[PDB]
Design a protein around this ligand. Sequence first.
Ligand SMILES: NC(=[NH2+])NCCC[C@H](N)C(=O)O
Ligand SMILES: NC(=[NH2+])NCCC[C@H](N)C(=O)O
Lengths: 286, 309
Amino acid sequence: MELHILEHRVRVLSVARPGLWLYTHPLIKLLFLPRRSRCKFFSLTETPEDYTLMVDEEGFKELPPSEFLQVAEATWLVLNVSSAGVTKIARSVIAPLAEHHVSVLMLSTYQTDFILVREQDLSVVIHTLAQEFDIYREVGGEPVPVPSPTVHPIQSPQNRFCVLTLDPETLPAIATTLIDVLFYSSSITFFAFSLIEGYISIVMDAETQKKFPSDLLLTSSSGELWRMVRIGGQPLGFDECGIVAQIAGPLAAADISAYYISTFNFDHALVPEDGIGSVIEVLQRR
Amino acid sequence: MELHILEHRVRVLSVARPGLWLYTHPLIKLLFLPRRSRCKFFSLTETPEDYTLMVDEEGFKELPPSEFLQVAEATWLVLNVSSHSQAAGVTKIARSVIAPLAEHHVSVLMLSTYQTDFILVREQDLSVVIHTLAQEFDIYREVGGEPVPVTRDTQHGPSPTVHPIQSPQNRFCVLTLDPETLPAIATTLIDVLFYSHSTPKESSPEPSSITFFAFSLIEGYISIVMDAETQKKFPSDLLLTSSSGELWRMVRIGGQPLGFDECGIVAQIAGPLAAADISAYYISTFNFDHALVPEDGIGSVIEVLQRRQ
Ligand SMILES: NC(=[NH2+])NCCC[C@H](N)C(=O)O
Ligand SMILES: NC(=[NH2+])NCCC[C@H](N)C(=O)O
């Protein structure tokens, strides 16, 4: 098993909903126009609270400072396990990093699971994981060999979610709908779009999927729908460890698959829709 | 022949290039989202100076005031002559519409599109317009999308002058599009309009290039005026031309910003072009006027227009 430190230096941002209009011009650029910036890591998540942006240093330069725009304190590095679910790395990655006081942010996409850590913790990350993983650093597309735990409240909306991908050539065909959804539109709004290393991933409501032109959004498991578990009552911050470990741990022990996405304020786990009853019950035992 | 007063009340605006960030949200909406606006008249023209908007009262509400937004005084009414019974465009109406309105001191704004030629007049001038044109035209007013017969019914700018002209070397296309195919060109249209390098604002009788891009959605119909080089950026089988071979040269009519009060600017261009039977589309922007003539006729046009007095 290999751990890869990817060639991305990511900043974590919050755009306040009343001030999204101001970032329309830079965000349209990052969403749709790859020749217009050197951005290679772009992730946008809409929640009721805010729009969460995970973006590299180059994409970060597109976004001017304002009262509507929060920036998390550190530069984040991106981790990836190779040879689509967080359950499989709960014991090997998530729990050991939580135990060694390394704070994470999660980004599950259609393609793979990204684990983000702060630049300051890389030495601790390597030390913790060098024994189990062959650790590689991505340079020029080539692999090169190298704050107190709390039980958090959980809730599940009735929304049914799809984890989707797209042929990068067909992105222009969904542009107007994606613009409409993002900038102009128990229930909780959740919309995630990411463009990472040319790969498109979209997390979407079943009702929102109806708005898109047919036969463009692709998935290997068509009709596989996911229920959301929202994690935290208060805003979670970026210092507290063991939050992902509280969720992925019991789910791995029950052998239930999960996507995991961290927003600026809250954590979000996606579980198979018919297994939601088992999931709530399993997590109730912490 | 008939003259139709269309069912539109228009405001004329200028968004300065440095203020594009503030207006991207309202502009994208008006361009691509017909369900989210009651707007039935939207015209956007990119120049090096600005973005000129001609928009109805409903679309006008989407645009908040700022140091980057300039709005003309008047509410404008839209006139149209359907004439298909020889030279094309505003040349068809130079003698019948444009010259008489100038003589009776009615200031105009022109918007030639793929479909037809729109003549914009200030609301306060409608009585004079009808009186000037009733003898030649059967005048109708659009009410609920149906024609209704019209039987009822001081200068504050600079003196009329001969305005300096220049002809940029760009080759322009007048294009339409199936409205159902607008989503397919959206990203390219966005890229061209809002994210491209434009020609500097800072003389030449024939400059190499000027930035000029016109898009309009009026009563469901799309019109695009575009550089021939710019056309290559778009996907292949979507833009519709109706021309095989010959394109259009711009004559920019300028000097000082033309304002909205001086009359006889369109007349001093369209009048001689009619006398020389040259096809002309004519687009007014916030600051300047733009005549499009057949590219092979450009030498004749310049020669004709330099005999103005
Ligand atoms: N803003 C957030 N979503 N914070 C929670 C992320 C997970 C937490 N830092 C952990 O290491 O377990
Ligand atoms: N802003 C302008 N483009 N003004 C010039 C428009 C033509 C002028 N008002 C005329 O009646 O002849």
